[PDB]
Design a protein around this ligand. Structure first.
Ligand SMILES: NC(=S)Nc1ccccc1OC(F)(F)F
Ligand SMILES: NC(=S)Nc1ccccc1OC(F)(F)F
Ligand SMILES: NC(=S)Nc1ccccc1OC(F)(F)F
Ligand SMILES: NC(=S)Nc1ccccc1OC(F)(F)F
Ligand SMILES: NC(=S)Nc1ccccc1OC(F)(F)F
Ligand SMILES: NC(=S)Nc1ccccc1OC(F)(F)F
Ligand SMILES: NC(=S)Nc1ccccc1OC(F)(F)F
Ligand SMILES: NC(=S)Nc1ccccc1OC(F)(F)F
Ligand SMILES: [Zn+2]
Ligand SMILES: [Zn+2]
Ligand SMILES: [Zn+2]
Ligand SMILES: [Zn+2]
Lengths: 361, 361
């Protein structure tokens, strides 16, 4: 059976399970079940399932080299699909809550869930809560007797917490750290002293890399009982390296990808985000370019936004980007080779994870 | 050592642990640590610690009848305090997110966290995420080697999910179920056909009883290794019975307790909540009183709010309340006696849980 159709079919199974349980144990009525079903589909479906399918792909790799009965192959593939959905639903939690926190308008070319007329923020906050709760319900039901339960839940819990800490890092990235104070309304930085490569790296590491790269790779190892085929420090290194690059691509697309292709009107500049473009620009600008950036960044005015985009284009950030890509392509290749000492298989899955990232469009 | 000072001291220990871990593993800087520390204190402290101290009290009860070395008594008490804080922090998650969802202004006589000038909704949503993440971090660190880990995490996970489903039940309680639809803005009910005792009971069961009563009692059993001293069906029955009464008291206080004592301006009537007062009033009203209730409920206008309060006072809901209290006092007494078959100890803890609830003021 092709991997994606297995994955998709497990979505239907897991949804049915979730909703039936709500009826049989949580007293739900049919109308609220339908609401939840619609919420699930709208928030979990329609992406490319990069994350959840990496779990399947890692598991498929091990299956090709490991002796098992047919029933055990099917069990492993089903557990990888369930695991993959846990990650998709965790992403869906974060996208719903982030869209509300950021006042986002669209995502993937449709309104953000909270903007739907019969949702509202009041419901959407809780719907996003539910989405993460469902990841646990899936795990306890499908993995109850599994040896990897404990490790998987502990891993998931750390990845979730890493992500939440990343979200803080991101939303506070245009404030001066020394002025953070619940009691005082926060001003935008005026010096941009914290727009550095190291501070950027921290935001991105936590905000995305753990759930987008570390968790899919490690969950595939866990459902395969293969965590001893890897050096885990290497897996975390490669995950953070690739996930950084992922984010750099997202930052460049926010500023330069047409909204129709983006699924989104990009507002990083108006929002004063600590983006790769801003940090790279500040790393090479002269005094007068810096001052022009400071007078124009983090403002809603479209003319000031256009001034910042013009400054980036004049600064030929394309060449800094090509140079960053080359260094990544090189470091990722190094790490793949180190991964081959213990598992050619696993290294190949990481290679596929890299090709897909590098060519994403 | 007195129970409350142990409990409070464990708060300091757990905070220190959390923040130190953020520094040592999650790359946090001192300013954001201070923000998190302030958030923790502001959102977790200053209530009466009813929930978390019930865990301690249940454990103390068992300690008085069970042979242990001194070190084991201390371990059990420390685990009960850690468990109790898990519940307090889970409550803190829900109060932060509920205050944002409901547009609340005050809680406990201070501004809701999201209203603090240097918080904002953007941060507060994520801060509430973090508060629930911390409950898991505590559990995995403090309970890693404990026999009750699995059971405790699974219990906590179900209680959290029950609560989230309760939140939905609550925020959708003034809508007609058949019209729920993400695509369509939701109108207030005009028939009030779903303001029944059974529908009320469902809201309250899920929204509060699981985390406020079931989880403290059962967590005290788990940290004590005493879950075989009880019939669990009885514990869940008593928990839901007492938790209902709790909520009825909260509903009456929202309408009739002075804001200075309430910590809050009560808005259940303007919000068209399915409150005990509304359901009880509708259960005894004549046709013309019903029509007057319908023309006045769920409106911001203070004169219409005053019309609804006048209607409740004319209807002598005090007498329906006294009659409800008597039936509860009777049912709770029945269940306490059933609990004594297996554990006088545990029954006494439930008695204390009841006295405290009944006399809360
Ligand atoms: N025994 C059950 S099935 N109790 C229960 C019932 C309905 C929903 C959730 C539940 O969780 C809890 F047991 F942890 F309390
Ligand atoms: N405690 C955990 S979860 N450590 C961990 C971290 C990062 C990757 C893998 C890890 O262990 C696993 F193999 F059990 F998942
Ligand atoms: N206009 C610029 S400075 N664009 C740019 C910057 C960094 C990476 C790629 C870029 O080219 C792209 F926008 F066409 F993709
Ligand atoms: N929607 C996208 S671009 N998702 C994605 C994320 C990270 C790597 C690759 C990705 O594309 C892929 F799914 F097509 F592979
Ligand atoms: N080995 C570790 S300590 N990894 C890690 C690092 C910093 C924060 C969270 C972490 O969680 C994860 F291991 F699951 F990936
Ligand atoms: N699966 C769970 S958690 N069942 C459960 C439900 C309600 C109360 C107690 C329960 O068992 C416990 F004793 F392990 F916690
Ligand atoms: N005015 C009313 S009908 N009050 C009321 C209703 C139900 C329970 C108690 C009540 O007395 C209290 F408000 F003073 F507490
Ligand atoms: N703040 C209050 S009234 N908490 C509470 C909740 C449920 C039962 C009793 C309570 O009072 C107590 F803490 F004082 F006991
Ligand atoms: Zn965001
Ligand atoms: Zn972006
Ligand atoms: Zn609410
Ligand atoms: Zn209330």
């Amino acid at each position: 059976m092709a991997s994606m159709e297995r994955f998709l079919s497990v979505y239907d199974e897991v949804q049915a399970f979730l909703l039936d349980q709500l009826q049989s144990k949580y007293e739900i009525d049919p109308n609220r079940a339908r609401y939840l079903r619609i919420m699930m589909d709208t928030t979990c479906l329609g992406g490319k399932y990069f994350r959840g399918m990496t779990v399947v792909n890692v598991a498929e790799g091990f299956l090709a080299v490991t002796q098992h009965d047919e029933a055990t192959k099917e069990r492993i593939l089903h557990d990888a699909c369930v695991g993959g959905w846990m990650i998709e639903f965790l992403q869906a939690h974060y996208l719903v809550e982030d869209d509300i926190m950021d006042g986002s308008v669209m995502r993937r070319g449709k309104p953000c869930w909270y903007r739907f007329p019969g949702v509202t923020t009041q419901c959407a906050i809780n719907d996003g809560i539910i989405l993460k709760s469902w990841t646990q319900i899936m795990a306890w039901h499908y993995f109850a007797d599994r040896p990897f339960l404990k490790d998987l839940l502990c891993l998931f819990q750390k990845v979730d917490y890493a992500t939440a800490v990343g979200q803080m890092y991101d939303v506070t990235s245009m404030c001066d750290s020394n002025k953070l104070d619940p009691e005082v309304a926060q001003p935008m930085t005026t010096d941009f002293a914290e727009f550095t490569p190291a501070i950027y790296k921290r935001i991105v590491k936590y905000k995305t890399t753990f759930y987008t790269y570390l968790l899919p790779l490690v969950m595939g190892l866990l459902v395969s009982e293969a965590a001893a085929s890897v050096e885990m420090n290497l897996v975390e290194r490669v995950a953070h390296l690739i996930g950084e690059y992922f984010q750099v691509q997202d930052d460049v697309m926010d500023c330069f990808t047409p909204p129709e292709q983006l699924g989104k009107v990009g507002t990083d500049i108006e929002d004063a985000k600590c983006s790769w473009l801003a940090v790279t620009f500040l790393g090479k600008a002269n005094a007068a370019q810096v001052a022009e950036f400071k007078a124009n960044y983090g403002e809603k005015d479209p003319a000031k936004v256009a001034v910042v985009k013009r400054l980036y284009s004049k600064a030929n950030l394309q060449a800094d980007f090509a140079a960053y890509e080359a260094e990544v392509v090189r470091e990722v290749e190094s790490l793949i080779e180190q991964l081959k000492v213990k598992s050619p298989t696993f290294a190949e899955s990481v290679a596929v994870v890299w090709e897909k990232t590098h060519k994403r469009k």
